[PDB]
Amino acid sequence: KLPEAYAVFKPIIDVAPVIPVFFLLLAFVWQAAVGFR
Amino acid sequence: MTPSFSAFINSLLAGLFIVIIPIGTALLIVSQSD
Amino acid sequence: RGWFDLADDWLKRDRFVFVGWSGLLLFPTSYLSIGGWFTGTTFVTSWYTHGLASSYLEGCNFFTAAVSTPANSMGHSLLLLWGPEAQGDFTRWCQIGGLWAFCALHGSFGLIGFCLRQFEIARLVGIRPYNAIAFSGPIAIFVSVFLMYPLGQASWFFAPSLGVAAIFRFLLFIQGFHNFTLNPFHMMGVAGILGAALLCAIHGATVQNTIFEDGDAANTFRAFTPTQAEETYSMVTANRFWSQIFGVAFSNKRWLHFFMLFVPLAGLWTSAIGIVGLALNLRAYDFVSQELRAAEDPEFETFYTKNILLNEGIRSWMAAQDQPHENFIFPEEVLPRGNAL
Amino acid sequence: AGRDIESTGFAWWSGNSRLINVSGKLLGAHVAHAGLMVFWCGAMTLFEVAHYIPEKPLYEQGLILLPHLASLGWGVGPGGEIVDIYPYFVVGILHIISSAVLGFGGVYHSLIGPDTLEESFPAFGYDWRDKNKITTILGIHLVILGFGALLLVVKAMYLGGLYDTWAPGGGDVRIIDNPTLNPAVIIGYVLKSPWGGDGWICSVNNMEDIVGGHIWIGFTCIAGGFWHILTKPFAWARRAYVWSGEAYLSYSLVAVSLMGFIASQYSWYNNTAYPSEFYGPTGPEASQSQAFTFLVRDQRLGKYLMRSPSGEIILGGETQRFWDLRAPWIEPLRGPNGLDLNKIKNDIQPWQERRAAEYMTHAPLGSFVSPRSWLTCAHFLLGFVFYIGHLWHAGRARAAAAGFEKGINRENEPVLSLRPI
Amino acid sequence: FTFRWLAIHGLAVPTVFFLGAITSMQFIQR
Amino acid sequence: SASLWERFCSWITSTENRLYIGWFGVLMIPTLLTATTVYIIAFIAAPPVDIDGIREPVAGSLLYGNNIISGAVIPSSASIGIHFYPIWEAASLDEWLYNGGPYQLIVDHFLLGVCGWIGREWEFSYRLGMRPWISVAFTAPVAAASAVFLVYPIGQGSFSDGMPLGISGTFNFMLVFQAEHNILMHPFHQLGVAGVFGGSLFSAMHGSLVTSSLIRETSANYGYKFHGYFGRLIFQYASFNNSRALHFFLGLWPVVGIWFTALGIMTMAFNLNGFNFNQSVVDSQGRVINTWADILNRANLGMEVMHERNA
Amino acid sequence: YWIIHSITIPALFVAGWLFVSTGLAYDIFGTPRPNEYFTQERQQVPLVNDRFSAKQELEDLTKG
Amino acid sequence: EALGVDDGRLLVPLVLIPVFVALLYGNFASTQDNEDFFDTYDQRR
Amino acid sequence: METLVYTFLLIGTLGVLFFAVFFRDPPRIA
Amino acid sequence: MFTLKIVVYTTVTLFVSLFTFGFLSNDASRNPNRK
Amino acid sequence: VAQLISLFLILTSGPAIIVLIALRRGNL
Amino acid sequence: GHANFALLFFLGHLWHGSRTLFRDVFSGI
Ligand code: CLA
Ligand code: CLA
Ligand code: CLA
Ligand SMILES: CC1=CCCC(C)(C)[C@H]1/C=C/C(C)=C/C=C/C(C)=C/C=C/C=C(C)/C=C/C=C(C)/C=C/C1=C(C)CCCC1(C)C
Ligand SMILES: CC1=CCCC(C)(C)[C@H]1/C=C/C(C)=C/C=C/C(C)=C/C=C/C=C(C)/C=C/C=C(C)/C=C/C1=C(C)CCCC1(C)C
Ligand SMILES: CC1=CCCC(C)(C)[C@H]1/C=C/C(C)=C/C=C/C(C)=C/C=C/C=C(C)/C=C/C=C(C)/C=C/C1=C(C)CCCC1(C)C
Ligand SMILES: [Cl-]
Ligand SMILES: [Cl-]
Ligand SMILES: [Fe+2]
Ligand SMILES: [Mn+2]
Ligand SMILES: [Mn+2]
């Protein structure tokens, strides 16, 4: 388990591994906003 | 006339008054209207 | 003009969705078949026909939910809602598997309506009706598998149930009880399907890799205009390529497209012939010479004999739960096994 | 503008292809992707530490980075048991913080930084056709890789050593005092057969060989980096390769595809660089452990043995196919002829029995998805798809060099000049 | 009340009903 | 031209030979011809092979009692495993034949030949000045062949688990794979089935649409010298107005499907099996209510209990 | 219009939810509840045996 | 074990054949313009 | 004896392939 | 067994050397757009 | 709830940059 | 035999009906 002090931030640590996927999606969002130009 | 024969004739009518008669009504109604 | 003329004019109107005369048969039948399949996979159980749970309501997912075939007590009955089996009771009609008959019949009529729709639309655009002849392949598949096979068997029970895992069961059941892989017509069907996939992939790659440089952009999808009298790809370059890579190549675009049409259609029709043969248990199950050789020579073994043993194991270990109406009870001693051999 | 199909010829779904001829934005994209990789490393390490249950082993909790950290010797005691997870937390924190710096660098060099580098920073600019500059960059990054390999060597020999499964009485964190620097062993490993019984480089079964090979790799990479910095490609190399960004990309793609296949085989078969106390037993290891447990339960309270195709004594049954397995819990029971029955009867240890039973319980090939299975499947798939990418990018690089990647010229089609066959 | 309108609502009113039914099925005890 | 080696290069890479050789053809032709002749000789006369390794050989040759359907080149002996087994690594030619060595020979030379075929397709595309991605399309059947012939034996640890070079042997491979791994419930085999079915559907559709709209220039095939219908059959939006995009999709769909099914075979080689929905429905009392997945599992168990042929 | 949809669609979704939550789906379609797969007298799988007495047989099977 | 060479005689084919063919290539290579080109590929042949 | 028939059919098919490859109708531009 | 091995090694080495030195002989220049 | 809130904030942070750039009419 | 014949003759009905109803456009459009 996490060291006890940092155990409160577990809910961030439980979502952080999937962040790069959102980055990919974010790129598409930028291409959507730009109008796929 | 067995209950089976009655079910068959009622089946014939329901097809006429629920499928054949309504759907055509629309075709004659809407075709004549346009 | 006459009512017919006015109705024909209205049905032929250029709307978002062509209706036509064939629509009067296609739209209600197809809509009812699809809705009945959704209703069966969502609410209707198979507990009283197959001894199984096949609904989202019972806890099944997309793979395990199915509209199961009627009970083996029904025979080849039409299972009309007003018929003597159900007598107008919707609940009993759903419990006995009548929704499968509903879906199958209205879906067969929907396939007929869609074929007529292809014919009608081809007659209006002014083109040859090579659609609705290609669709005769899927029509024959559906007729042979979902209609002719159960009609040749004991009842509708042995037809495929409308589900993913149900279709997989049907595949393994047919393999176990018929050895359908050994059937030459099924082999021709497999050849047709795989060759059609090969033709699709190879033709797409060949066209994409022989395009003319009709644009200055690196992405070449823009260099094709919708009304293009000139050809967008080099047939001569593609011919030379395959002539010198494979040894033979297409030189006629017409023939090539007719061949790409013909291969899957011929495969499907051959597989339909094989399934029609299976409908009467007239199966290419075994080779008599190989069986005689294995009987008089215990040291003679081929992969065909191993397949026979696998089919026997499939039948013996799936009969009890796949056909609960027969009340099969097989002791562990008579169940085939590899160690038991 | 350079950010649309009108000015570049590339659509949005091929939009990063617009980065080929602009250096600053390409550098920013690479630094941003590096930041993404470091962020994933740190975040996944924190995720695994946060879900680590002390009683369960590492391989029973679906963890793949903690075994990598345990192989390096951090937070592991004798027998593969995990003492504390704090160094793993430190590793995750350091990676996830350096990810912020790398991401800022990528964003800066991508968005606001100069599009091209040679007009403002001539020491960093390039043309994809200046062979000397590209070889210089290759040599610098080769020196970096060699220094990384030497850093692993220093960790192995000086800073706490590395975990060794082949230590007596179970694995332990050991300092690699004398690595194998003899070139014959390394060359034989590189030139070994890849088939069953030999295994090529996957079959390295001791830490000394690993450390010596990494010494050789680091020094060779440093020497080659200095070479490529101080030299230019020769005449045979210049006429053989396409000199463009896409060609170099394809070369890297096929290299990493081969590396992915090698790593998948390493995770599936090797139990020295991938200890079974962290990654779980291999499939052959699990099968042989089940057979050995049955043999032990037959000896207590012969059946279970047969002869190999070369005549040696091996475990009998469906395991016979896995007689090439070498595992620490079974090596003391194996003699020159093969496994020895009296040595199993007498010279057996309780820890070997415990290892055999616990590996029998958890079988990748089947006696629970093994972490070895996940690593092997993932990196085999990655190797295959990157071979596909190499083929695509190499073919397109060849076509673009020649000038026919956009289609055939109607004015002068080549086939039309060739005589018919 | 057009053919597109009638076809859409024929393919929408059961769709939403079945979506609600399946969402309710998701919270059954099992 | 100016050199003997230059002349040799200008003949290996000549576009005038009836069939292109090329450099990939320098490796492809010997390997493919060797595998072809060894396969023919084995399919007619090979001795029976002890595939299981327990001294009960299995016959797959025409001369030992097999027909075209039942004939196969039996995979290598389970005692061999995935050890390299050439002719010179066997004590005698008889023992080489007895342990399934010709299977390894054919498989290795055939894989080298199909890799050479991929490279040769690229090479002739480059020689003709056309685009090079036909080989990318051909990678998918090559990937499938390597998965069923090389990758699966590597993951399982024995060439005896590879697909036999026959028809009934292929069926046995499919049945044993379904028993052991439940490939039907694997999403990648489902993607492959979708790929092949879509390929057949799209080939038939494209052929029907091209043949239907043939311009009257005339057999109708002699009319050739060496969208509205589709948008009315379905709603207007679903239509491939761009011919190049349509052909790209035609190339893409089955290739992607076969790639996915080959990847699924590779993953199941390392025991990344299909979905398991067994015993997914229970009543209040705890009794298991069977589904179609349970019937599928019963069939898989029936197949598996007669593969062991041992404890 | 949108306003209409903003009332009709949620009401229809709630009706679909209540069709299952109130147990009306089981009654309408005959799907057994999780507590009524096996009765005390019949611990076996219930199967229809005759086609012309199927309604009465199902009434007998589902009576308990 | 290296390259499956268990008998020294196997090294004779392994070395003499690559050298001999290189000798044929040496003549192609010497008949060429081996000056640098500054392009994606060398069209001089 | 059926092995003779099988071998004859296989070589006939291979010969048909050979003649189709090396004795095809030569394509020409019309 | 040795003679078959040496023959196979000779043949494989010859073909691999031909492949390697053929793709080293400025293969990119062997395209129809080359001047 | 904490996981959902953190996920929502992280998912908002991405498009928020694009929205702010569009509001300031920068190089998007 | 007659089931297979009936299926093949359904195919024949489709083909010959298409031939007679779309005769004008048979050589092509
Ligand atoms: C990880 C993968 C990756 C990377 C590193 C890049 C990087 C880049 N792309 Mg590529 N791209 C990608 C994936 C990627 N892309 C994918 C998947 C697609 C397909 C949808 C594209 C499609 C595409 C096109 C079509 C184009 C690019 C272009 C570019 C460049 C500038 C983009 C721009 O103008 O930003 C504008 C975007 C914004 C202003 C909004 C995003 C703002 C930042 C980046 C968000 C970052 C969030 C992060 C948490 C901030 C950290 C702060 C830090 C202090 C910690 C840049 C080098 C362009 C270019 O330069 O071509 C010459 C171009 O034309 N790309
Ligand atoms: C990522 C690292 C990297 C990269 C991209 C390059 C790239 C290059 N090098 Mg450099 N080099 C490197 C590392 C690297 N080198 C290192 C570490 C060294 C030190 C040994 C050298 C020493 C070196 C010299 C001395 C020369 C090059 C040359 C070249 C060029 C042509 C190379 C060629 O055609 O290969 C040819 C490849 C072979 C002939 C294959 C040899 C394989 C050996 C026998 C080992 C076999 C292993 C195994 C059995 C087979 C591989 C299996 C695989 C799965 C690992 C090219 C620009 C040449 C050049 O033109 O530059 C001046 C040149 O003369 N390099
Ligand atoms: C280090 C590796 C690497 C690098 C730098 C490049 C770089 C490039 N490639 Mg290559 N490529 C690679 C690997 C690589 N590729 C591999 C491994 C493959 C095989 C799959 C390909 C196949 C390939 C093709 C077929 C093409 C390129 C193209 C390109 C160019 C534009 C890429 C672009 O805009 O992306 C845009 C990014 C996207 C459209 C996003 C795609 C998202 C994928 C499909 C999802 C995959 C699953 C995902 C990872 C899971 C996340 C789940 C999420 C969706 C929820 C660029 C030069 C194109 C080009 O212009 O050629 C020069 C082109 O046509 N590449
Ligand atoms: C998430 C996801 C992932 C992958 C992509 C994806 C697939 C798109 C997506 C899925 C999304 C999903 C989950 C999509 C699912 C959408 C659903 C569940 C649509 C349900 C529609 C129900 C209909 C049409 C029933 C009509 C009833 C009728 C006709 C009654 C018939 C009657 C019967 C019974 C017989 C008696 C007579 C009558 C009265 C006629
Ligand atoms: C201390 C502490 C104790 C324990 C708990 C704790 C909280 C976890 C820890 C905190 C650690 C901390 C505070 C860690 C710090 C973590 C942070 C803030 C990491 C952020 C990294 C940013 C990256 C990788 C962005 C790169 C930009 C990209 C890829 C943009 C690309 C784009 C380009 C260029 C253009 C458009 C396309 C796209 C793709 C959109
Ligand atoms: C962990 C960490 C450490 C501690 C500090 C910290 C800062 C709090 C943190 C860092 C956090 C970081 C680095 C956070 C950065 C987070 C990011 C980059 C979030 C991006 C979110 C974008 C989404 C979800 C787009 C969804 C679009 C969809 C689904 C649709 C797209 C569609 C469009 C429109 C176009 C059509 C195609 C499709 C694809 C259909
Ligand atoms: Cl078997
Ligand atoms: Cl066992
Ligand atoms: Fe076409
Ligand atoms: Mn196996
Ligand atoms: Mn088995």
Does the beta carbon of A5 lie inside 6 Å of ligand 6?
A: no
Could you tell me how far CA D211 lies from the centroid of its own chain? 16
**Resolution given for this structure, in angstroms:** 2.2
Burial string for D233-271 (b: 16+ CB within 10 Å, else e) reads beebebbbbbbbbbbbbbbebbebbeebbbbbbbbbbbb
> For residue H28, which residues of chain F lie inside 8 Å, CB to CB?
3, 5-6, 9
Which residues are D164's β-sheet partners? D172
Q: How many residues are listed for chain L in this entry?
A: 29
- Cβ atoms of G17 and E24 within 8 Å: the answer is yes
Q: What is the DSSP string of C177-207?
A: HH-GGG-HHHHHHHHHHHHHHHHHHHHHHHH
Beta-carbon-side half-sphere exposure of residue E21 (alpha carbons within 13 Å): 23
How far is residue C172's CA from residue C318's CA, in Å, rounded to a whole number? 10
Beta-carbon separation of D47 and A31 below 8 A: no
C55: amino acid identity, one letter = S
D92 CB contacts (<8 Å, ≥6 apart)? D41, D42, D43, D44, D45, D46, D49
List the single residue in I with minimal CA-CA distance to D421. Answer: I26
How far is residue D383's CA from residue D327's CA, in Å, rounded to a whole number? 28
Phi, psi of C252 (to 5 degrees): -115, 120
Can you state the angle between helices C184-208 and F134-146, rounded to 10 degrees? Answer: 150
- Cβ atoms of D329 and D336 within 8 Å: the answer is no
Q: What is the DSSP string of D330-363?
A: TGGGB-SSBB-HHHHHHS--HHHHHHHHHHHHS-
User: How far, in Å, is the centroid of ligand 5 from the Cα of D59?
Assistant: 29
How far is residue F100's CA from residue F95's CA, in Å, rounded to a whole number? 9
Q: Which element (helix H / strand E) includes F110?
A: helix F101-128
Strand D172-174 relative to strand D162-164: parallel, antiparallel, unpaired?
A: antiparallel
- Cβ atoms of F11 and J31 within 8 Å: the answer is no
Question: Which of E10, E21, E30 faces C42 most closely, judged by CB atoms?
Answer: E21
Closest by CA to C103, choosing from C88, C93, C91, is: C93
How far is residue C264's CA from residue C276's CA, in Å, rounded to a whole number? 18
CB proximity E13 to C under 8 Å: no
Q: How many residues are listed for chain H in this entry?
A: 45
Q: Which two tokens stand for residue D40?
A: 């994933």
Q: What is the DSSP string of J11-35?
A: HHHHHHHHHHHHHTTTGGG-STT--
F149 CB contacts (<8 Å, ≥6 apart)? F107, F110, F111, F162, F163
The residues whose Cβ lies within 5 A of ligand 11, an ion, are: F 304, 307
How far is residue G21's CA from residue E27's CA, in Å, rounded to a whole number? 9
How far is residue F122's CA from residue F23's CA, in Å, rounded to a whole number? 11
Which numbered ligand comes closest to the C-alpha of D251?
2
Could you tell me how far CA F180 lies from the centroid of its own chain? 20
Residue nearest atom 36 of ligand 5, based on CA coordinates:
A27
Which of A6, A10, A12, A25 most suits a substitution to test ligand 6, by most atoms within 8 Å of the C-beta? A25
- Cβ atoms of F271 and D365 within 8 Å: the answer is yes
Q: Give contacts of L 1-29 with F, CB under 8 A.
A: 27-29
What are the E-state strand segments in chain C? 66-67, 162-163
Q: Which two tokens stand for residue D64?
A: 């793949």
D86: amino acid identity, one letter = Y
Beta-carbon separation of F215 and L29 below 8 A: yes
How far is residue C307's CA from residue C176's CA, in Å, rounded to a whole number? 9
Q: Which two tokens stand for residue G41?
A: 């007298």
F102 CB contacts (<8 Å, ≥6 apart)? F38, F39, F42, F46, F73, F96
Closest by CA to D131, choosing from D225, D30, D234, D227, is: D234
SS3 C290: helix
Q: What is the DSSP string of C72-133?
A: TTS-S----TTSTTTTT-HHHHHHTTHHHHHHHHHHHHHHHHHHHHHHHHHHHHT----TTT
User: How far, in Å, is the centroid of ligand 9 from the Cα of F55?
Assistant: 55
How far is residue D180's CA from residue D157's CA, in Å, rounded to a whole number? 12
CB proximity C329 to G under 8 Å: no
Minimum-distance ligand 2 atom for the alpha carbon of D131: 57
Q: How many residues are listed for chain B in this entry?
A: 34
Q: Which two tokens stand for residue C103?
A: 């879906």
The label of the residue with tokens 């990318």 reads: F136
Please give the radius of gyration of chain L, using alpha carbons only, rounded to the nearest integer: 12
SS3 C67: strand
Beta-carbon separation of D243 and H40 below 8 A: yes
Minimum-distance ligand 5 atom for the alpha carbon of D29: 34
SS3 D240: coil
User: How far, in Å, is the centroid of ligand 1 from the Cα of A30?
Assistant: 8
- Cβ atoms of C316 and C224 within 8 Å: the answer is no
How far is residue F303's CA from residue F171's CA, in Å, rounded to a whole number? 13
Beta-carbon separation of F213 and L29 below 8 A: yes
Q: Which two tokens stand for residue C326?
A: 């027969």
Which numbered ligand comes closest to the C-alpha of C40?
4
Question: Which of E7, E28, E30 faces C17 most closely, judged by CB atoms?
Answer: E7
- Cβ atoms of C214 and D407 within 8 Å: the answer is yes
CA-to-CA dists, residue F63 to D287, F45, F48, I7, angstroms: 38, 6, 10, 10
Q: What is the DSSP string of D263-329?
A: HHHHHHH-SSSS-HHHH---HHHHHHHHHHHHHHHHH---TTEEE-TTS-EEE-SGGGGGTT---TT
The 8-class DSSP code of residue D112 comes to: I
Find the discontinuities in chain A where C to next N exceeds 2.5 angstroms and give the residue preceding each.
none
Q: Which element (helix H / strand E) includes J5?
A: helix J2-23
CA-to-CA dists, residue D254 to C107, E8, F136, J23, angstroms: 50, 51, 14, 17
Judged by phi (left if over 0) then psi (alpha if -120 to 50, else beta), residue D281 lies in: beta
CB proximity C82 to B under 8 Å: yes
Which of D129, D228, D248 most suits a substitution to test ligand 2, by most atoms within 8 Å of the C-beta? D228
Beta-carbon separation of J22 and F13 below 8 A: yes
Q: Which two tokens stand for residue E24?
A: 């309710």
Could you tell me how far CA B3 lies from the centroid of its own chain? 21
Can you state the angle between helices F292-304 and F168-181, rounded to 10 degrees? Answer: 120
